[PDB]
């Protein structure tokens, strides 16, 4: 039972870490797909 509780706490910590890593990857610009979408956004705006 206590091992189950430990596992739940570790799971929560891991989820928080993963979400932070993804958001910061987007922020830094390492997310190539997001960069493609944003450059498409800018090009569409200028063309319009």
């Amino acid at each position: 039972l206590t091992l189950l509780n430990q596992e739940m706490q570790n799971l929560g910590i891991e989820f928080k870490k993963y979400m932070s890593a993804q958001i910061n990857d987007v922020v830094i610009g390492n997310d190539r797909e997001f960069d493609q979408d944003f450059t498409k956004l800018k090009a569409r705006m200028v063309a319009r």
Binding site: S20, N24, V27, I28
Partner: protein, 48 residues
């Protein structure tokens, strides 16, 4: 020491600075140097 220093990247230090300050998406240019110092010291300590 030699390998880590010759492979140092400013972007990694800036990413560390952004992680250190969650409530802001931008880090001052000076934070690059601070995080570089701290990263160097921490990695060297782990190797030790």
């Amino acid at each position: 020491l030699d390998e880590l220093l010759k492979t140092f990247s400013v972007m990694n230090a800036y990413k560390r600075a952004t992680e250190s300050h969650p409530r802001n998406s931008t880090a001052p240019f000076i934070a690059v140097l601070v995080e570089a110092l701290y990263y160097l010291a921490n990695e060297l300590e782990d190797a030790f």
